[PDB]
Amino acid sequence: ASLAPGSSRVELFKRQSSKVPFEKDGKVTERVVHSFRLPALVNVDGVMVAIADARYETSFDNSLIDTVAKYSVDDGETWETQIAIKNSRASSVSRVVDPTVIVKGNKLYVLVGSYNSSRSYWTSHGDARDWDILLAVGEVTKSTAGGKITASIKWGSPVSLKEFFPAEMEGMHTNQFLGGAGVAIVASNGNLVYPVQVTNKKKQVFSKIFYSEDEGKTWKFGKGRSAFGCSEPVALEWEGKLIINTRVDYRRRLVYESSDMGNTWLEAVGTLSRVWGPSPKSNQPGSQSSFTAVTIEGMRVMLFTHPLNFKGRWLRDRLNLWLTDNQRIYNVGQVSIGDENSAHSSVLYKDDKLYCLHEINSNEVYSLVFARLVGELRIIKSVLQSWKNWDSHLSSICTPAGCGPAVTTVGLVGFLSHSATKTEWEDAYRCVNASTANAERVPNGLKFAGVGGGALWPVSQQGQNQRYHFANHAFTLVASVTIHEVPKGASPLLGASLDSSGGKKLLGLSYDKRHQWQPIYGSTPVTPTGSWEMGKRYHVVLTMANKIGSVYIDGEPLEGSGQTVVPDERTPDISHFYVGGYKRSGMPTDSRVTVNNVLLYNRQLNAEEIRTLFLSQDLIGTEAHM
Ligand SMILES: OC[C@H]1O[C@@H](O[C@H]2[C@H](O)[C@@H](O)[C@@H](O)O[C@@H]2CO)[C@H](O)[C@@H](O)[C@H]1O
Secondary structure, eight states, rough: OOOOOTTTTEEEEEEOEEEEEEEEETTEEEEEEEEEEEEEEEEETTTEEEEEEEEEEEEEEESOEEEEEEEESSSSSEEEEEEEEOOOOOSOOOEEEOOOOOOOTTTEEEEEEEEEEOOGGGGSSSSSSSSEEEEEEEEEEEGGGGSSEEEEEOOOOEEGGGGGGGEETTTTTEEEEEOOOOEEEOOOOSEEEEEEEEEETTTOOOEEEEESSSSTTSSOSSSOOOOOTTEEEEEEEEEEEEEEEEEESSOOOEEEEEESSTTSEEEEEETTTTBBBBTTOOOOOOOOOOOEEETTTEEEEEEEEEEEEEOOOTTOOOEEEESSSSSSSEEEOSSHHHHHHHHOEEEEETTTEEEEEEEEEEEEEEEEEEEEHHHHHHHHHHHHHHHHHHHHHHOOOOEEOEEOOOOOOEEEEEEEEEEEEEEEETTTTSSEEEESEEEEEEETEEEOSSTTOOOEEGGGGTTTTTTTTTGGGGEEEEEEEOOOOOSSSSSEEEEESSSSSSSSSSEEEEOTSSSEEEEETTTTTTBBOOOOOOTTTEEEEEEEEEEEEEEEEEEOOOOTEEOOSOOOOSSOHHHHOEESSOSSSSOOOOOEEEEEEEEESOOOOHHHHHHHHHHHHHTOSSTTTO
């Protein structure tokens, strides 16, 4: 339970306690609600709106559900309650579901699925007999009446958008669709954009972008789609693309990019795709996720939440929040408390305060808690100042022949330099440390010695959540090194390992008893090349892209460098990077070397940025700057 220092919370929508105005046959009554689910928390012009399911009788998905809203004009001290949308009232189990919310001006656009009488889960329905898809538009107006600031919201009659759903898509016959739940966006050209989950007559699930250029009068689907198996998509716009982050049951979450309103989808292999696991071993159901772009203290970042689900199934305990600038991926920490069940969530950033509406579940009775994320916003601002300082400090270095090109920070993701503890080498970017053994701190890095010496920067080793999954598609690992002793055989100095030992490599660099380098390319025959001297430091660059590895000493490729390291159409799964040894006592090499300033970029640096880092190795360390 990390609800941070100075952060606190209330139980806003109290299961079996909070009442709503329930309407039926021309009569409104105050009704105690069983469970509140599917939190959507937004800002309309300074009115904090909280939208959710009111699951009246039971938390069963297929039961009687209206869309409730609660709205506050004082940043969630007091709230007014209403029912935003009501179901058909056609049976005891009629329902409007997966409320998905777009804010635009003083308007709230809410899309829901609607079901009349089925008790089966929607993905199992072989047709659309019980289903409709409805947009209701709520309008917020703002008074300062009788002295104090007041507000209300008038909700419109839902309008069916079923006319806008084609009966065919590529290679399939359509079935039903719903919003991804949570909060959607207005694009920077003004369009309304819902990422939606859709099923076909084969009952497969897959995600699309459903949009409107006309304030919601009419609706299109992007031509493209996600893989099958992708559900509850949640989307934001980042630097002119849509980022569509999807739930994938029993798998790691797939993230996609689309630069043309969803006409073409490319998997975001270089950044965020397959980063987040739905459970420790990613073999459990996943979750709805809050996924938004904000500007905090002048930097555009993204915020993402998803339960860790230690418990497995749909329990979905331990809601975590993540920060990213589409390069570094920082775990802010756990928002929910202890081991409580805590599946959906909605993060709002408003007037430079952070808030989160999330579920808590005990025994299938759900409340939505409203939390003030003050400590979290503090951690975030600190991590961001850190990102800003290192990028600015690296980028103002005057690189030598006054000045050559700046040290590149585009795509720099991790940085091991001057800070280290007794057993860890610290990421200056503060997201992923390397563990160490037999490590002696020297300026801007470590000196390693003896069997099992070295550092380990985890890749797949990060566990359920893998920030460095990009490395499987491209990376550049850079480092200054010095060999202090002539090894007895070939010893490692640096590389990306595919297994836990370091014995099955993707790409690495070793050095041998003959004073030669042994760059290693996958499982290819190793060929010693070049020459070094005990005591001279050297600059080393490993790049991999397009399934091609290359090794540089002092800014210059080794002879025969640029070989195939991925020997077929399967994607590697890198376990970790090893630095200055294997950091394994089972591996019988002894690397006696010093390694300074390890940089990890999410791309193949080009000739010039490699030559700049080389000539700049003495200027980039963190040493002076702490
Ligand atoms: O546990 C509450 C959640 O149930 C999920 O439905 C599961 C169900 O729990 C499981 O026991 C079995 O029947 O499979 C269902 C999926 O087809 C719902 O998906 C989820 O939304 C919660 O209500």
